[PDB]
Amino acid sequence: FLKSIASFNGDLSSLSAPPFILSPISLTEFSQYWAEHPELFLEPSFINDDNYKEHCLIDPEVESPELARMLAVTKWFISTLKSQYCSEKKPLNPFLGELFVGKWENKEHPEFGETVLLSEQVSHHPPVTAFSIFNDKNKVKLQGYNQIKASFMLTVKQFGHTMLDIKDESYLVTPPPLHIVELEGKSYIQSSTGLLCVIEFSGRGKKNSFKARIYKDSKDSKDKEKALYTISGQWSGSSKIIKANKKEESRLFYDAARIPAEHLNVKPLEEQHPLESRKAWYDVAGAIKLGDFNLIAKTKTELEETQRELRKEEEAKGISWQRRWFKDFDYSVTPEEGALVPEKDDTFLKLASALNLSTKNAPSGTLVGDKEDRKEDLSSIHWRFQRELWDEEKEIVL
Ligand SMILES: CCCCC/C=C\C/C=C\C/C=C\C/C=C\CCCC(=O)O[C@H](COC(=O)CCCCCCCCCCCCCCCC)COP(=O)(O)O[C@H]1[C@H](O)[C@@H](O)[C@H](OP(=O)(O)O)[C@@H](O)[C@H]1O
């Protein structure tokens, strides 16, 4: 049916979607699926030199807190997969400058504190969503950006990465490659402790299967037999964990059949800013819920039209659209003059270097030296969160 778009050569985001496939939900809302389970997102921050063994229920004989926290982070990463990768309508392609904010109050857990979700569409050509999720009370901070490049056989490339900070401890996370939805290739979790987790996805075997191995260092990752732990199963189901070679003492690691302890708190439409997602797409979302294809086309075209004419006003003024909470930094070796450049002790560079991960705009998970890494004129612009920009915020509230 719609497959008649296969003849097109290039990024599908250049095309336009027929109303009958549209979801009333914008892609900027999918940012929440990085911390959908508040307790798992915060767990690592509760593990310390004095309680790691009692917190590592999967292995009360864990060697160190660094390792106990890696296990919690691994469990957390697994939990984000289902809600993110589990007819089905296509989410709306966000407009440039589109915001989505919310918060998990965690009322039944005063020790959790408030966790804030900030999400912004920092690019429309091509579509790129930046995001941040932070819990000041426990010093857990997450930031990253996402980009989906669909091309035509239907290919789907994943770009970007996510960085998690548990106090003074850092974790680099790279999204998994995929295909129409099943995951493939590898995801990486590189900690500032030297610890590395390599998640290998496979389909066909059972659906949504994966193997996750934890290594003491990136040198050990070369040989799977060196793995300290081995986790296996379905990320949409259950998975087992084996320490070293103790195949006899296999354990349940994570059970994806999990109920969210809390839903994301979003303020009512009346209080929302014209830039906030649900407020801006209000009419379209309504038409979609209604089933009126012509109303969907009308309301949507008028939003895209306003956006288009808005760009024309900027182009004819020499000025451009100012991103709100995220700034684009240049990680290339020959930065353009006047470009934003990374700090001295930049976390990304440090962790990427340990993983030997490419810092270019190659598909997520690309290692230094791969075919994609050595591609001509490849840039290295990465969106970064600026906590100050949110602190200085005057209009948007939670
Ligand atoms: C972290 C989140 C989870 C990861 C993502 C999950 C799955 C990804 C896997 C496969 C998805 C790939 C392909 C899906 C298969 C077929 C549909 C793609 C064909 C397609 O309509 O062209 C694209 C969307 O296309 C993607 O932007 C590429 C697709 C990106 C969207 C990803 C979600 C897709 C979910 C699968 C739903 C399949 C539904 C199809 C099956 C129906 C039963 C059209 O956008 P739209 O009309 O909404 O958006 C328009 C903009 O609003 C306008 O401003 C723009 O005007 P401009 O300003 O003048 O340029 C205009 O050109 C449009 O961009």
Swiss-Prot record:
Residues recorded with modification Phosphoserine: 353
Protein residues bound to ergosterol: 84
Region (OSBP-related domain (ORD)): 4-330
Residue span of region ALPS motif: 1-17
InterPro entries with a match to the protein in the record: OSBP_sf, Oxysterol-bd, Oxysterol-bd_CS
UniProt main location, coarse: cytoplasm
Outcome of substituting residue 85 to F: Abolishes both cholesterol binding and biological function
Residues recorded as bearing Phosphothreonine in the entry: 334
UniProt-annotated location(s): Cytoplasm; Golgi apparatus membrane
GO cellular component annotations of the record: cytoplasm; cytosol; Golgi membrane; membrane
Keywords associated with the record: Cytoplasm, Golgi apparatus, Lipid transport, Lipid-binding, Membrane, Phosphoprotein, Transport
Phosphoprotein is among the record's keywords: yes
Binding site for cholesterol: 84
Pfam families: Oxysterol_BP
Family of the protein in this entry: Belongs to the OSBP family.
Entry remark concerning the domains of this protein: The OSBP-related domain (ORD) mediates binding of sterols and phospholipids. It displays an incomplete beta-barrel containing a central hydrophobic tunnel that can accommodate a single lipid molecule with a flexible lid covering the tunnel entrance. The ORD can bind two membranes simultaneously. It has at least two membrane-binding surfaces; one near the mouth of the lipid-binding pocket and a distal site that can bind a second membrane.
Function: Lipid transport protein (LTP) involved in non-vesicular transfer of lipids between membranes. Functions in phosphoinositide-coupled directional transport of various lipids by carrying the lipid molecule in a hydrophobic pocket and transferring it between membranes through the cytosol. Involved in maintenance of intracellular sterol distribution and homeostasis. Involved in lipid countertransport between the Golgi complex and membranes of the endoplasmic reticulum.
UniProt miscellaneous comment: Present with 32200 molecules/cell in log phase SD medium.
Name under which the protein is recorded: Oxysterol-binding protein homolog 4
Lineage of producing organism: Eukaryota, Fungi, Dikarya, Ascomycota, Saccharomycotina
Gene coding for it: KES1
